[PDB]
Amino acid sequence: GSSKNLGGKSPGKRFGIKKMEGHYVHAGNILATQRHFRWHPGAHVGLGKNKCLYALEEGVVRYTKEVYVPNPSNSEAVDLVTRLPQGAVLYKTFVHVVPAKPEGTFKLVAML
Amino acid sequence: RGHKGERQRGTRPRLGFEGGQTPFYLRIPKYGFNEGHSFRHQYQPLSLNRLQYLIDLGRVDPTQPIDLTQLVNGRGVTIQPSKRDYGVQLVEEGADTFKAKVNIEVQMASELAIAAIEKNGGVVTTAFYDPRSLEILCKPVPFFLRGQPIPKRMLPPEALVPYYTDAKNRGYLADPARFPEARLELARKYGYVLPDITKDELFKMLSTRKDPRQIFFGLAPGWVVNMADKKILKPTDENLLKYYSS
Amino acid sequence: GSKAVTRHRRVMHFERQKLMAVTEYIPPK
Amino acid sequence: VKCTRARRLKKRSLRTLWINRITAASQEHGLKYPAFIINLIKCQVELNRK
RNA sequence: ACCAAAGCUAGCUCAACAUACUAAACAAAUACAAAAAUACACCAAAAUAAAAUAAAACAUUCACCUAACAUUAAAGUAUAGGAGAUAGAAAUUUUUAUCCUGACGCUAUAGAGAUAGUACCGUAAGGGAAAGAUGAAAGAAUAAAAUAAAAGUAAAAAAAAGCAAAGAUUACCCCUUCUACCUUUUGCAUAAUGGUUUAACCAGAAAAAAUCUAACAAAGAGAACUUUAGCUAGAUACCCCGAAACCAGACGAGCUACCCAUGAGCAGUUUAAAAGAACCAACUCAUCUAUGUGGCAAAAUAGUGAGAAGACUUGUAGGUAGAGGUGAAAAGCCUAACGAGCCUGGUGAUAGCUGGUUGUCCGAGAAAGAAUUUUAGUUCAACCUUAAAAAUACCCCAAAAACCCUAAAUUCCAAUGUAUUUUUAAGAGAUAGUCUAAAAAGGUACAGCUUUUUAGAAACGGAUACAACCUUGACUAGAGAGUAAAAUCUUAAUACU
RNA sequence: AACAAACUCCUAGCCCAAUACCGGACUAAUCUAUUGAAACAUAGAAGCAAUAAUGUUAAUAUGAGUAACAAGAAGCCUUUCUC
RNA sequence: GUUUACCAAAAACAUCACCUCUAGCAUUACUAGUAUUAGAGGCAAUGCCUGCCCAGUGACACCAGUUUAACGGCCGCGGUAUUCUGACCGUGCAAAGGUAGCAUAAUCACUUGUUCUCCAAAUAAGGACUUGUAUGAAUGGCCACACGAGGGUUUUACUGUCUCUUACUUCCAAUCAGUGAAAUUAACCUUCCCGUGAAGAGGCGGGAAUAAAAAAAUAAGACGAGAAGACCCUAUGGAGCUUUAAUU
RNA sequence: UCGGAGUACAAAAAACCCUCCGAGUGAUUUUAAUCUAGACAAACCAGUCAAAAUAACCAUAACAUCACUUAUUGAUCCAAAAUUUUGAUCAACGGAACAAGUUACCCUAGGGAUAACAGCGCAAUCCUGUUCUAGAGUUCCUAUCGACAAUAGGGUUUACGACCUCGAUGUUGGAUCAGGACACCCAAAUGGUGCAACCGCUAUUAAAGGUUCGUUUGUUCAACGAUUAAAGUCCUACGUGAUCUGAGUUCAGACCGGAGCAAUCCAGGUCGGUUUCUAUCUAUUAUAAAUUUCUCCCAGUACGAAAGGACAAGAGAAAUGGGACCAACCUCACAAACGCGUCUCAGAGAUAAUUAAUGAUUUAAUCUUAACCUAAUUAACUCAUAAUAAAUCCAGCCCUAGAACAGGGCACA
Ligand SMILES: *C(=O)[C@H](CCSC)NC=O
Ligand SMILES: [K+]
Ligand SMILES: [K+]
Ligand SMILES: [K+]
Numbered sequence A: 001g002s003s004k005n006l007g008g009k010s011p012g013k014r015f016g017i018k019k020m021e022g023h024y025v026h027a028g029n030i031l032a033t034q035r036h037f038r039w040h041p042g043a044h045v046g047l048g049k050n051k052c053l054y055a056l057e058e059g060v061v062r063y064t065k066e067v068y069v070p071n072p073s074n075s076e077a078v079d080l081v082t083r084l085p086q087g088a089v090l091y092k093t094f095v096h097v098v099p100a101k102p103e104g105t106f107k108l109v110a111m112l
Numbered sequence B: 001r002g003h004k005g006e007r008q009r010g011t012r013p014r015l016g017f018e019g020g021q022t023p024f025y026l027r028i029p030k031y032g033f034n035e036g037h038s039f040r041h042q043y044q045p046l047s048l049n050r051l052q053y054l055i056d057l058g059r060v061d062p063t064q065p066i067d068l069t070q071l072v073n074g075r076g077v078t079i080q081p082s083k084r085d086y087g088v089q090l091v092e093e094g095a096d097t098f099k100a101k102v103n104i105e106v107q108m109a110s111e112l113a114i115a116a117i118e119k120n121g122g123v124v125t126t127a128f129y130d131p132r133s134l135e136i137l138c139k140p141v142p143f144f145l146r147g148q149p150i151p152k153r154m155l156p157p158e159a160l161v162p163y164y165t166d167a168k169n170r171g172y173l174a175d176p177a178r179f180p181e182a183r184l185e186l187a188r189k190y191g192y193v194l195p196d197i198t199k200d201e202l203f204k205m206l207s208t209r210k211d212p213r214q215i216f217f218g219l220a221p222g223w224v225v226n227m228a229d230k231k232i233l234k235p236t237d238e239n240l241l242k243y244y245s246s
Numbered sequence C: 001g002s003k004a005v006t007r008h009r010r011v012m013h014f015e016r017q018k019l020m021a022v023t024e025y026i027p028p029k
Numbered sequence D: 001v002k003c004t005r006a007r008r009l010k011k012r013s014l015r016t017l018w019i020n021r022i023t024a025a026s027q028e029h030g031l032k033y034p035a036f037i038i039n040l041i042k043c044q045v046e047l048n049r050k
Numbered sequence E: 001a002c003c004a005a006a007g008c009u010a011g012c013u014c015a016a017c018a019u020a021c022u023a024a025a026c027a028a029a030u031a032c033a034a035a036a037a038u039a040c041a042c043c044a045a046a047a048u049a050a051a052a053u054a055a056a057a058c059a060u061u062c063a064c065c066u067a068a069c070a071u072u073a074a075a076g077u078a079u080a081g082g083a084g085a086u087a088g089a090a091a092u093u094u095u096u097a098u099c100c101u102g103a104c105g106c107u108a109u110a111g112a113g114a115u116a117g118u119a120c121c122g123u124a125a126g127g128g129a130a131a132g133a134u135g136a137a138a139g140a141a142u143a144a145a146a147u148a149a150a151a152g153u154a155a156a157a158a159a160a161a162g163c164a165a166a167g168a169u170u171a172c173c174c175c176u177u178c179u180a181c182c183u184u185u186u187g188c189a190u191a192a193u194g195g196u197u198u199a200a201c202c203a204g205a206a207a208a209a210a211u212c213u214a215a216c217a218a219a220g221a222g223a224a225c226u227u228u229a230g231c232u233a234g235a236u237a238c239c240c241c242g243a244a245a246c247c248a249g250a251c252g253a254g255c256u257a258c259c260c261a262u263g264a265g266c267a268g269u270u271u272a273a274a275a276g277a278a279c280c281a282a283c284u285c286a287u288c289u290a291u292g293u294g295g296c297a298a299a300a301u302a303g304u305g306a307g308a309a310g311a312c313u314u315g316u317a318g319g320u321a322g323a324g325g326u327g328a329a330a331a332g333c334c335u336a337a338c339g340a341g342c343c344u345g346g347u348g349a350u351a352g353c354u355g356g357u358u359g360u361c362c363g364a365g366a367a368a369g370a371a372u373u374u375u376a377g378u379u380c381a382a383c384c385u386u387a388a389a390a391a392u393a394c395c396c397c398a399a400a401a402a403c404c405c406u407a408a409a410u411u412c413c414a415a416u417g418u419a420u421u422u423u424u425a426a427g428a429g430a431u432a433g434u435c436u437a438a439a440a441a442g443g444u445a446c447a448g449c450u451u452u453u454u455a456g457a458a459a460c461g462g463a464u465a466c467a468a469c470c471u472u473g474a475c476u477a478g479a480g481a482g483u484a485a486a487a488u489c490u491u492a493a494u495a496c497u
Numbered sequence F: 001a002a003c004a005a006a007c008u009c010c011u012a013g014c015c016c017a018a019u020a021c022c023g024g025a026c027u028a029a030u031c032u033a034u035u036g037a038a039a040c041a042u043a044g045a046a047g048c049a050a051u052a053a054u055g056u057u058a059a060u061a062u063g064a065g066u067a068a069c070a071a072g073a074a075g076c077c078u079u080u081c082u083c
Numbered sequence G: 001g002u003u004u005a006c007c008a009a010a011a012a013c014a015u016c017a018c019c020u021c022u023a024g025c026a027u028u029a030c031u032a033g034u035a036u037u038a039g040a041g042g043c044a045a046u047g048c049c050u051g052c053c054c055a056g057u058g059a060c061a062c063c064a065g066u067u068u069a070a071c072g073g074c075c076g077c078g079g080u081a082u083u084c085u086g087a088c089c090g091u092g093c094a095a096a097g098g099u100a101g102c103a104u105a106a107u108c109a110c111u112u113g114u115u116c117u118c119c120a121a122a123u124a125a126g127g128a129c130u131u132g133u134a135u136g137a138a139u140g141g142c143c144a145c146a147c148g149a150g151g152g153u154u155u156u157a158c159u160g161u162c163u164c165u166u167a168c169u170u171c172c173a174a175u176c177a178g179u180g181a182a183a184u185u186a187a188c189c190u191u192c193c194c195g196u197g198a199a200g201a202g203g204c205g206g207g208a209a210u211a212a213a214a215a216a217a218u219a220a221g222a223c224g225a226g227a228a229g230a231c232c233c234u235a236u237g238g239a240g241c242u243u244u245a246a247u248u
Numbered sequence H: 001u002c003g004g005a006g007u008a009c010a011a012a013a014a015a016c017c018c019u020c021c022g023a024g025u026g027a028u029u030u031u032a033a034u035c036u037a038g039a040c041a042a043a044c045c046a047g048u049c050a051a052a053a054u055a056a057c058c059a060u061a062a063c064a065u066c067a068c069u070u071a072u073u074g075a076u077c078c079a080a081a082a083u084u085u086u087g088a089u090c091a092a093c094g095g096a097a098c099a100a101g102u103u104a105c106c107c108u109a110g111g112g113a114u115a116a117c118a119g120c121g122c123a124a125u126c127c128u129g130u131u132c133u134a135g136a137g138u139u140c141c142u143a144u145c146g147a148c149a150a151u152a153g154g155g156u157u158u159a160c161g162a163c164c165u166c167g168a169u170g171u172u173g174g175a176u177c178a179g180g181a182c183a184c185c186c187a188a189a190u191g192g193u194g195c196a197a198c199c200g201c202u203a204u205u206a207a208a209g210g211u212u213c214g215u216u217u218g219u220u221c222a223a224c225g226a227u228u229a230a231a232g233u234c235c236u237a238c239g240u241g242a243u244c245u246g247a248g249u250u251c252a253g254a255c256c257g258g259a260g261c262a263a264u265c266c267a268g269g270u271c272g273g274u275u276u277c278u279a280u281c282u283a284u285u286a287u288a289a290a291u292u293u294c295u296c297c298c299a300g301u302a303c304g305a306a307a308g309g310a311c312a313a314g315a316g317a318a319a320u321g322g323g324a325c326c327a328a329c330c331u332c333a334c335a336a337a338c339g340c341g342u343c344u345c346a347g348a349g350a351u352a353a354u355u356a357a358u359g360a361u362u363u364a365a366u367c368u369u370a371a372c373c374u375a376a377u378u379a380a381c382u383c384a385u386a387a388u389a390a391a392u393c394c395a396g397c398c399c400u401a402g403a404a405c406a407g408g409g410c411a412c413a
């Protein structure tokens, strides 16, 4: 016969994890890019409009399992929390960046 | 060579052709980076570090006034009139260690370069040279062998009139009455005492200048230099004298 | 090449045949 | 080309020829070649087949 | 021992100088059908060159390509271009005379085509060769000297068995071991391509950026330019043969198509008939079959056939010429090939396509990701080669990477084992893949089938033969030794009174 | 057990395969600059090397002494016969 | 009568006849002519005929319009007389809806349509039946005399065509004497079988056979010799022809 | 061309004329600024995020939202608008500024990288045998058959793949000559039967020989007439064109129907249409020792209610095939050749399926991959037997011997 399926060809977007645990990253480096929320951002990690995670401070990347407390203004998420039984808590994965360099140091500039 | 194709038969396409695909040099929008580059003026930079270096080694001497011709004979700078070079600009790279006292004439100067020279008690003046005149000025001996009268130096174009008319740039066409007040402003700005140049024994040499219609020192338009006989020819007709002096 | 599952008792690689012959069952005597 | 390849085979062919002579001379005494060689090495007698 | 071999002149090439440039011969005859002494004439002419090609197609465009007055620079600059390919000035500058001219040019398949535009092939324009060797004397031919060396033959036919040889051997064979050589391919002893053999001849060429060596150095260069260690000079580089075609100008209607002139043929027989009537010769066509197929013949011979007073055959001579002529249209014929002649010039047309590519040895050594009138090709990335700089590369434990269920396992990383990797500067090839094991898909849970991902291989040993399976770190010599993969696989069965 | 490799030992070394592309060291034969003087050395230059293009020219073979070609007879020699 | 000189001589072209079209006229064609003339074409004597259609295109008029012997075209669906058939009727679209004739034809397929005659036996041939849903009227329909190196069938007569080959002559042929060519050729010391293999082996593997040469024969193989496959595809390779391709 | 899910199971990437969904934009207002660290992605061109800083406004205010939110899009040049800005089903979507058909009149360069013919691979299709019994067979599974299903093998058909050949592997049917297989049509032997006999159906064993002549079609095939013991199936480059044929396919001419405005096209028909080769090598160029049918007879017997009607055994005559020969007839103008004419044609061993005797494992029985002995029994095949036979005159002539070379005669002829 004849082919009915069309348009199935599309290259991958290379969605995945870029920096593993222990990698030393600087400010602005994209930790990971994703389609859906696979890894939630953590401490010192921003979140772009396309759900990509980028480090805000220079340091060591760490991955952690933590609890999930949704924003009350998010109607869909708060409804899911409402229907949970009393003994359960949501758990999600997070990406952290523990800072390495200190904020600054005091130096002698002038001795009057 | 290879095995078959356009490699072994030597008929591969031109340079920059990517096989039907639009080439890299044809998919970039046109913008003016070299628009009118053949008409932009160029100035060879001269640093005060090199100017001090020439004087210490005897390449040039401050006793005699220094202009573009003396720099070329000293192998300090090379000027190519063909490549739209309009002279030498003074830069301030070595202003801190400049201890010479000269009467230098250039085609462009900076605020710090002028201040550095005036600190020691020198004179800086900027003059414009047409490419027809600049070729003669940089290579005087070849010109004198062409058997032609010395022509008048042309005026700067409308674009370069303000630069050589203001007293801030020490323009050759500037009003001399505004030089002393402009000189003192630089002395006040950089905090150096302005020397009284009129009390130095070289005041006659330091005050030497050129007429705007004059090319060389002491020579006049219309003169023919017969180098073989070591004699200078001068015109006599009223029209010839008027044309070469107007 | 044939599929992993066929209808004709797929012939093993010769190295695998030796493995199937050295790992036989010998009843106690 | 045949000269070099045969030169490699020259050593093999002569070694094969020696074994046939050793086997022929060993069978004459009623002892096979495999029994004549291993039971001679066990006596620490290191004689090559040549 | 024949056939053969050897020789060094003939002359030529590229310049320079240079008179200033259709030679030599012209007694007679030469543009009547040239070389024929002699009668009322006509005579003469111009209209931009086009295209093959490049732009990977092709329409605007495409250097030189008829007419420039040169050289050093301005400059491959200003400008002109489906603004693509490529095309490209000027203003302004530089240049001292005569002699010193000859040859790191050839030596009879070279150099001009040349002993010669002659033989010879073409109606014509046109194409166009091979060919010489003794010595001081051949007025020294019972004459003399020289290599006796190419393929091919003779002296001298052959004796089982094999890519014609090697290992050898007292011995030519007999024995043992080896699937011609290049090209082209995933893979060729292949029954895929080319070559009978010999001699002669025949195919890599350019200096912008770069690397190596040297001069001088913040300056270099014997002007004109380049310069934040650069500038000047040297050395290191990129083939040959071949289309069908396209354009312009010549020469061809003595064959053939048609026509205009001028001539010449048709006997007998049958009919009031010279009626595109009838029988049958000369004569003209060529239906059918058989010989012939490098033939007698680049279209014929033998037999047999159709017309044979007409729209008929035929001689001489003239006319129409290729964007055309001519045609009772067969897309026929126009000098033995006409879907549009031949010759020369443009022309060394251009081919991603086929074939060819000439001494020895040594080092390292690649199977395909992305665009593309693109998949028969190119240009990038990866990989790799040469040189250089630098510090980290592989293996890599614990920790770590998603939400309903989910295998083999990947990513990332210290130690450790080991020397690799990155960067900079120059680069080409390749981009047409075959099988085995594993995870899948299409198919017939078919293919030596097809599309992807991971891994392997392309022995001179083993599976008798064998590209892909197994053993194997590919040097040379030895008549030494130890080993690896591996050589014949199992059963072949049932009395129940 | 044995027999069995480009593997690995043993004795000497010049001390490890290859297609496209790339790198290197040498070198046959010519001419020229200086040497050399029974045929060479160090250099500078190129028409610088042919077992392969249904390659060009010339000469040789094989096919093969094979395919195929021709003169009517006798005599007294040029005259009679047969077509 | 004519044509593809050199594979087609025919059913193709021409042709008398009929018809359409364009032109009122002078010094080189047509023509030393003047519409009963001369060109540009179609179709093919004769005989009986040549039906309907200017919507489209083209031409003329160059405006309405006029022209098909100009290019071309010349219909569905549903119901209806016991059954069958469908005179008729409903409804729709068109410029008109294939009229006369002939017909399983040289006429898509169905197809060896069905039937009769011919033969012992008929995918042949002739005569009928006939929607041929793709026949058809000067791109001509239909009928006939004469004619045909066209194509098909039947009877009669003859015969080596054949059942079934044979005898005898000449040119070839084979021996002797003379002259003496061509395609071809990697090297050959050039076997058979089974198996293997770039998938059909004189050459590999496992076995068999095996003194060496000459002459005369038959053509199974050497993927025999000959022509760089005419078929097929590819090439940003050509050319001829046509037009509603692009540019002009 | 662009996006999502599976193939691609756990970092990334990953294909098919693979399996399924979509996009070539709408709705709304929160109308979404300037400038810059660092990164993801990637051949390139493109695509994405983004802290700090500045301005905007709660006076220390930057993610436009929703529809699977992911895709909702286009490079230069060029053109138009104010200079801010815009412009393509350029969808062939990395895009030539603007270009269709046909070629069987075809040409050139190449490809077995790629088709038709042939081989090969494979077995969907096809063919052959077995396993399983529901049932058909009046009762009765398997005398003859056997649905739904199981399993093994053959390589004939149409396909599938595109692996060897396109610097050529010549292509249907006949003519000639046939080589081979057995899954046998006839001939021979035998088991079973819903086998009385006759005529049949079915199964086992055997391949030495044989398998007709005609009308139509180019035909293989098929139909029909006559006959035979029977008119087998298939392989062999669907054998065989360097042996022949060219009717058909399969060039150039020409009509008819149809498609196209045309050129031209049609596995639609019709008429016509060049079939080349001198044999180099391999291979090859005569032994025999028959086969079938019909008649008569047995016999109108056996067998059967009758109707019908045998086998074996005996005798004879023909046909084909093998090998020979002219007294006659016939071809016959040589003294020969020739057919249409004449002549001749064979014994023993040995077997397959099957049938029977004796007899043990199993003191019965039982033909025995139990022993000994023995019996009935297909065709091949083997052999008896027959043919061949003398080593060494050979110039010449003759010959029923012969291409040459050889061979037989030449004393009385
Ligand atoms: C099929 O017809 C083809 C020829 C085409 S040209 C007559 N066969 C080729 O072998
Ligand atoms: K071939
Ligand atoms: K080839
Ligand atoms: K070749």
Ligand SMILES: [K+]
Binding pocket: E253
């Ligand atoms: K003429």
Ligand SMILES: [K+]
Binding pocket: E296, E297
């Ligand atoms: K002739």
Ligand SMILES: [K+]
Binding pocket: E352, E376, E377
């Ligand atoms: K290509």
Ligand SMILES: [K+]
Binding pocket: G009
């Ligand atoms: K005729």
Ligand SMILES: [K+]
Binding pocket: G054
């Ligand atoms: K009309």
Ligand SMILES: [K+]
Binding pocket: none
């Ligand atoms: K009829």
Ligand SMILES: [K+]
Binding pocket: G148, G150
């Ligand atoms: K005729």
Ligand SMILES: [K+]
Binding pocket: G219, G220
């Ligand atoms: K043969």
Ligand SMILES: [K+]
Binding pocket: H092
């Ligand atoms: K495209």
Ligand SMILES: [K+]
Binding pocket: E446, H122, H123, H160
């Ligand atoms: K198949």
Ligand SMILES: [K+]
Binding pocket: H165, H166, H168
């Ligand atoms: K072929």
Ligand SMILES: [K+]
Binding pocket: none
């Ligand atoms: K048979």
Ligand SMILES: [K+]
Binding pocket: G190, G222, H281, H282
């Ligand atoms: K042979």
Ligand SMILES: [K+]
Binding pocket: G166, G167, H331, H338
């Ligand atoms: K006869």
Ligand SMILES: [K+]
Binding pocket: E495, H366
């Ligand atoms: K028993």
Ligand SMILES: [Mg+2]
Binding pocket: A009, A010, A011
């Ligand atoms: Mg993809």
